[PDB]
Design a protein around this ligand. Structure first.
Ligand SMILES: [Zn+2]
Ligand SMILES: [Zn+2]
Lengths: 157, 150
């Protein structure tokens, strides 16, 4: 019905997700034309997938349902403010809007601080917790060349 | 002094607009008795007015010139199909007719797509992207009441 009810459904999902031991306190919902096209819950541990956050799980499901890779005319509801990873996913997916209940400071007080990642994505590379090394390969442009060449390429941007 | 030349003029204003850095690619003119009464251009950024679209501007100026709030006997020539708020403004301004060159499609292929607003306007308040709330007040009818008297 209204944004509250859907967002309410997302928080309910997070709770059921916890009590059922499938994952962390995160839930998400994606709707299109007033229909809940997907429901996601954080299931990182229970499915050995560090990228399995509520929003990422809902996106994957939502796209599978639409047999598409873009979430046009869709709205994403998360029980809490998206993580940087989950944010990049939002922008690659392209929903027209996103709503969230709990803030990231709330997640931090709970033991789920994603701040260290905002700090790192802001740094260069060589200056990072996890060291990033850029190796010089004479053929580093090869895959872009193979792409310019491939005719039947389905552009996804 | 011809339908085509007036529309052409709106388009010429549309270009000058972009060029002079005064705003987006949109121009409009209103004519009365074969003469151009007012001109508008998209100047939203340069005047801090998000309602400052070409058509909207052109009719505000015209109404001022004519000292009226209805343009019941004027024509609007606009460089492109009107935005929805512009259509609303047109239905309130009430001109004889309106001409346009570019269509809502041409503008969409330039980063200017209003269709999302069309969709939104159709959807009831609850479904709209932007959050809408209808709190109920025990006197939410008093303004109309006060109107029934005046
Ligand atoms: Zn996340
Ligand atoms: Zn407009």
């Amino acid at each position: 019905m209204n944004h509250e009810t859907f967002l309410k459904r997302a928080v309910t999902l997070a709770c059921e997700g916890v009590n059922a031991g499938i994952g962390g306190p995160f839930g998400a919902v994606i709707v299109k034309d007033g229909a809940i096209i997907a429901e996601g819950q954080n299931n990182v541990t229970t499915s050995n997938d560090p990228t399995a956050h509520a929003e990422v799980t809902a996106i994957r499901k939502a796209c599978k349902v639409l047999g598409a890779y873009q979430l046009d005319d869709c709205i994403l509801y998360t029980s809490c403010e998206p993580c940087p990873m989950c944010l990049g996913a939002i922008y690659w997916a392209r929903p027209k809007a996103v709503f969230y209940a709990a803030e990231h400071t709330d997640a931090a007080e709970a033991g789920f601080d994603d701040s260290f990642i905002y700090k790192e994505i802001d740094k260069p590379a060589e200056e990072r917790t996890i060291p990033f090394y850029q190796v010089t390969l004479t053929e580093h442009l090869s895959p872009f060349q193979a792409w310019r060449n491939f005719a039947n390429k389905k552009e996804y941007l």
